[PDB]
Design a protein that fits this description.
Chains A, B, C: It is found in: Cell membrane; Cytoplasm, Cytoskeleton; Cytoplasm, Perinuclear region; Nucleus. The structure is a homotrimer. By secondary structure, chain A is α+β, with helices and mostly antiparallel strands. Helix content of chain A is 34%, strand content 29%. In chain A, a hairpin with a 2-residue loop joins strand 2 (92-97) and strand 3 (100-106). In chain A, helix 3 (51-58) runs antiparallel to helix 4, helix 4 (67-88) runs antiparallel to helix 5 (112-131) and helix 11 runs antiparallel to helix 12. One chloride ion binds at residues 94-95, 158-159, 328 of chain C.
Amino acid sequence: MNTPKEEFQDWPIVRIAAHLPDLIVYGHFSPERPFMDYFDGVLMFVDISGFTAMTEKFSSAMYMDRGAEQLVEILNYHISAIVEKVLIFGGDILKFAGDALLALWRVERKQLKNIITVVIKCSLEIHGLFETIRVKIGLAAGHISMLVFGDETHSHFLVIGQAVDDVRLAQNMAQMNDVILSPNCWQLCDRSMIEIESVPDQRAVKVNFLKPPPNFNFDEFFTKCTTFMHYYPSGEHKNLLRLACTLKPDPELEMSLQKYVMESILKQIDNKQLQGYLSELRPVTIVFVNLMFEDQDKAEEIGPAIQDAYMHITSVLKIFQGQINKVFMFDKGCSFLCVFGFPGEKVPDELTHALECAMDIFDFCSQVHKIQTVSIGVASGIVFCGIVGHTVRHEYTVIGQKVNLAARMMMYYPGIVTCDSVTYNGSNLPAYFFKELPKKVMKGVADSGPLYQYWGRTE
Amino acid sequence: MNTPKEEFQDWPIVRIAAHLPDLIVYGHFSPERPFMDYFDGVLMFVDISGFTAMTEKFSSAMYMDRGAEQLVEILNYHISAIVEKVLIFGGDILKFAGDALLALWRVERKQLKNIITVVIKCSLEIHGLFETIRVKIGLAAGHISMLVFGDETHSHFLVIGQAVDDVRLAQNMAQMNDVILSPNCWQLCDRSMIEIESVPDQRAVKVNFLKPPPNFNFDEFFTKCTTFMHYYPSGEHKNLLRLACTLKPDPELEMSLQKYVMESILKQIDNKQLQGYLSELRPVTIVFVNLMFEDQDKAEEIGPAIQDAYMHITSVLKIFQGQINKVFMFDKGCSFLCVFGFPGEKVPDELTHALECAMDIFDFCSQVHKIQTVSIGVASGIVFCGIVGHTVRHEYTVIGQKVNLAARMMMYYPGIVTCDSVTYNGSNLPAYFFKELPKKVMKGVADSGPLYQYWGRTE
Amino acid sequence: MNTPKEEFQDWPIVRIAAHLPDLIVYGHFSPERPFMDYFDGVLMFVDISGFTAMTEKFSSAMYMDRGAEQLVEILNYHISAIVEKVLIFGGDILKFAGDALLALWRVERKQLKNIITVVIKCSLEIHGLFETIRVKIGLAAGHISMLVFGDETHSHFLVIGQAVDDVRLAQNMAQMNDVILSPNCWQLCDRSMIEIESVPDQRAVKVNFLKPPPNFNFDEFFTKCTTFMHYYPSGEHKNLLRLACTLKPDPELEMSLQKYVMESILKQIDNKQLQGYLSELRPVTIVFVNLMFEDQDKAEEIGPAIQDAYMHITSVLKIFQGQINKVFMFDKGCSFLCVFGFPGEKVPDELTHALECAMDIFDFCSQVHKIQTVSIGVASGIVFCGIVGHTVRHEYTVIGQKVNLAARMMMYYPGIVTCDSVTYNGSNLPAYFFKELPKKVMKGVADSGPLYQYWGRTE
Ligand SMILES: [Cl-]
Ligand SMILES: [Cl-]
Ligand SMILES: [Cl-]
Ligand SMILES: [Mg+2]
Ligand SMILES: [Mg+2]
Ligand SMILES: [Mg+2]
C-alpha cells in the first residue's frame, strides 16, 4: 500500500488562527465577559520607525497608483523576518499595530530569569537583520493580566499591568537600535550575562552586549528553556513556525476564534473576496478613544468598565457605520482605534457621523464607573489599510500620519473631543459647534494644521 | 546542466478529473447515447449519519452567517479521510451523494474473492478513524453494468444491477458502525478469513472480524492484489493518491470530461469565479424524480428509456431554469435529483415553475416505453450546496432535510407528483390544483408538515 | 532552535519579473529615453506552426464556450516545455509573440563559438520534444543592440541589428523541424562539430547533425560555458529555473519593472482580479503599425525616431482607447501591434476610432525624421488574448487569423493605411473615405475578403 504525502491543509480554522496569538488560540477560557486571567512573562515591544513617512511617500505619483501594493510588500518583507525570529525563539506575537508589534513569552516565575536571556538574544538578532528605517525594542518582565471583552458576536483582548506599561515606556526611550530593559526586567535578569549602560534620568537600562561565560552554549540553554514552552513546534512538527498551523476543523473552536476577526477578513478567508481587496490607501476618518482609570494596572477594576464602554461603543459604531480596528493599553489608558470608511464600509457624511459618534461615546463613557477621563481624537485623510505580518501570523492594521495625529490629539488634549482641519472643514456642521484650539508641539507630528474641539450642539 | 524540480501542474483537465471516477476518466468509450458496458466488481457504500441534522443546526444564529463555510469544512475534513482510505486501498470513488459515497473495485471474476478481503479491511479501517455522527458500510459484489446517457453537451453515468441494488440494501440494514455484506458478497468471499453473524430476517451478514491465518501478511497480499488494479499509483507516482493527478492537457479528452461537470464548477476551475462562491446555505426547490421499470437490473432495457426521459427532462429544466444535480439508482428505480435556485441560477416564481416542470416531466415520462411508474417529490427550503470530498476527488452536492423529504415523498407516494407545505403555500397557483394528502410515517423524517398532491390545472 | 522551511515567496516583484527577460530584470540602466546598449550574442527564434489555425477551430461549438480556456491550456503545455529547455540551457527568453518566442544568449565575443554549440544542442532537443503542429528554429549570432523607449509610466524594449534581421530570415526558410543558421552564425560556429546542408538560393545553412569528436562530453562542455553565464541558477539555487525567482522586494526596482507590464496584468498580480479573466476569445480590432528606416540595423539613428513615434502613438491610443501589445523588429522595420477592445478596455464605435487613430498615427509618423515609410494594417475579428508561456516566464499576447492578416496587409500594402472588410463594413464612416484595393496573394492568408485603403475625409 502506498503512503502518499499529506498536503498542508489550509482549512479556514488555520487561516483564522493566523490572526491570533497562542494565548487566544489555545486559551480555552470562558465565554463570559469580561474575562480576566493573570500570569507572568516577558514582553518585547518592537517598533519599526519610518514606515508612517514611507506611507506618505507611497501616495505620490511615482508609485503609479500601486502605492498600497508596494507598501504592504516592502513592509511585510521586513516584518515577516522579525516575526520569524520571534517565533523561532519561542515567543507568541500578541498584536500588531501599525509598523510595531508586541510579543510575549509566558512562563512561570522561576523561569523568568532564563527566558529574559533568550528574549535578549532574540532582540539582538532582530537588530542584526537591519544593521545590514530603524528598529527599536523595549523589553519588560513580571506580572501580566489579560482581559477579554466583547459581546455575543465579537471578542477583543488586551494585556494589562506594570510590565505592559513598562514595555511601552522602555520602547519610547530607545534610540535607533537600542534594546532597553524595564527596571524590573533588569532586576530579574541574569546580570552575569548581560552588559548594560544606565539611561539618563532613567532606571531602565540599555543592553550593550550579551557576554556569556566560558562554558555557555546558547543552543543547549535554549533547549532547556523549551521545556517551559507549551507550544514550541517539536518532533514531527519541528519544521513549522507555529503549532497553530496544525489546527484541525472544530466548529466550536472556530466559532469562538472568528469573533476576534473582522467580517471582511473572514470573507477573504472564505474565498469569497479577492486576497488583494483589503490592501489599499484610502480616505478614512480615525476616531481614537482613550479611557483613563485611577489604576490602569488593576484588571479587576478596569475590566468591567472597559466591557461597559465596549458595549456602548460597538452599538454607536454599528449605527454611524464604523469599526474598532484595535484596542490596547497606551502609557495612559485603554485606547480604541476606531475607523470610519474601511473596505466595503463607506457611508456618506462619514465626517459628521464620526463627530456625532465621538460625542456620543464621550458622553456615555464619561459616566461609566471607574473611568476618570475620556479623550477622543478625530482625524481624516489617506491611510494605509492592510494585512501586515507573516503568512503564519498577521493582522489587519492601519498606518498613516492621520492615525498618529488622532493618537497624539487624544493624549495632548485630554478630556475633550478634538478634530483636525479636514474633519472640521468637511463636516456638514455649523462652525460654532467647534472651538479653535491652541497649537501644541506634539511628539512625532510635523504640522497638524489648525485643531478644533468639538464642543457640540449647545453652549 | 540543472535539473530543476517539476512543479505539480494543476491544469484544467486535472481539475476536471477530480470530479470524476477512473471509470470515466480512463474509460475512452463511444460518444453515442445511451452507452452501456458490463463488468464485475466489489462495491462499497459508505454513509455518514447525522450530517443532515448538522446541516439544520448550521443555519442557527450561533454560526454567525458562516454556517455553510463551517459545515463544508467539518464535512470535508471527515470525508477526506474516508476518501484517502478508499483510494489507498485501490478503490475508485464513483459518486458522492449528500454525506454518502459509493466506491468500486473493478476486477475480473477470478479475483473477486481476494478483492473482497481488501475491501473488508478498508471498510474496517474506515470504522476505525471514527471509533476515536456514525459511519455505516454496505458491501456487495458481482455483475455490474454502467450506463452513460446524455446529449451533445452533457453526460451522466450510473451503475446498475443486482450488486448495485444489494449494496444499498446492505447499507440500510447497518447499525452505527456495521459493515454488512450482500448475500452474494458473503457467498464469493474468503470465508476462512472473515467472521460473521447473521442478520435477522436477512440473508446479508455482518462482519465481526477479519481473522487471517498464521502465515498471512496483509501488505504482501495487497501487493498481489495490485496486479489486477489498472490504475494504482506506482513507481515514480507511488506518492500520488490518483493517477488522474498526472493527466496532461488533451483537448479531445477534456471536451469529453467537461460534459459531466456543471458550468458553474467549470467557471471556478477556469479561475473565473472565486473558489468560495459555491459553498452556501440557500433556499432552493428540490424536484426528485423517480422512474421505476419492470426489471431495474437490465441495462439494455432501461438504458434507452433513461436516455429518452433524460432528453425531455433536460429540455424542461432548461426552460423552467433548473439543474440535474445527481442521478442514481435507488432501491426502486432511477432517480434524478433536480434543483431550482442553484448559484447564479435563481429565477423568480421558482415554486410555480418547479411544480409545472414536475407535471411536464411526469406526463412525458409516464408514456416512455418501459417506464412503469413515475413519482416526483417537490420540497423547498434551505439546503447546503457545495463541493464535498477530497482535493483529488470531490463533487458538487446538496444536503439537507428538504432533500431527504423530497426523496421520501417520491418513494412513499408513488405514481403522483407531491409537494411540501412551503411549495404549496408559496406557489402562485390556485388551491384546487392540489389535493391535501394523508400523513405517512416516513423513515428519517420528523414531521413533514402537510403534504399535497399536485393534481394540476383540470379535473 | 528550530530551522523551519522557508516558503517560496511569490512577492509581486517576482510575479512582475515573470513577464520580463533578465536583460531587463537585471539591466539596471538609465531611466532616460531612448536608451541604447550594444553587445554580442546568439539568438534563437522558435516558431510553433499551426496555432493560429487551432485558434480558429477553438471558436467552434464543439468547445462549448470554453475555447479560450482549452487553447491556452494546450498552448502553454507545449510552450512551457520549450521555455524550460531554453532556460536550462542558459538562455534568456526576450519576448513571446503569438505562438513564437525569441531567446538570447548574451556573451562576450570570444565565447560566441562555444555558445553556438550549446544553442544548437538546445535547438535539437526542442525538435525532439515534438517528433514524439511543428516547430521551426532560426539561429543567428553577432552584434546586437537593445533600445528601451517610453515615457514616465511605460517602457518598451526591443533588440535591433543584423543578427536580429538574420534570425527572422532564418526562421522563415525553415521547414517543419529545421534548425537554420544565419550565414554569420555558420561562419562563427565550430564547424568540426556541426554537419550542415546548404539551402537553395541561400547562404544560411541547415543543421543535419551535431557530431562531436571522441573526447567530447556535453555536460563538461556546458559547465565550462556556464562560467560566462551571469545569471545561471547555481549552488543553493540550482533547483530554480530562473534567478529572478529569488528577487526580493525593492520599491525602486519594482517601479522600474512594472512600467513594462499592462495595468490589467498588474491587477491580476496584485490579486485584485481573478487569474482567469484575461484568457478570452474576444472581438478586437488590430492596428499593426510598421515604420521603415533607411538603415534598420543602426540604433543611434532609429532609436530617437522610434521614441518620437512612440510618444505620439501612446497619446492617440489613450484618446481613442487602445493598447500597444507588442513591439518588435520585422524583416522590414519596427512594428507596433496595437489592439482596441482588450479586457476592460472596450469602447463603442471601436472601428471608426481604430481607423481615425490609424490615420492620425500615419500622418504624424510620416513626418518624423528618419522614418522613410509608414504602413498600417487594420483588421477586426475574434482573437485569442491571454498569458502565454511558463509559470516563471510568460507574457500577455494575442493570436489569431486577424492578427496575421493585419501584419500581412501592412507588409503587402506599404505606405498606406489598409483595412479589412469587417472594419470597413462596421465603421460609421462614408464609403468614399475608402478605396477598394486589388487582391494580393499573401503568405499565410487563405482568403482575406475584400481589402480597402482608408483614404480619409478629403480627396
Ligand atoms: Cl494588547
Ligand atoms: Cl451511480
Ligand atoms: Cl525584441
Ligand atoms: Mg510605529
Ligand atoms: Mg446520508
Ligand atoms: Mg507563429
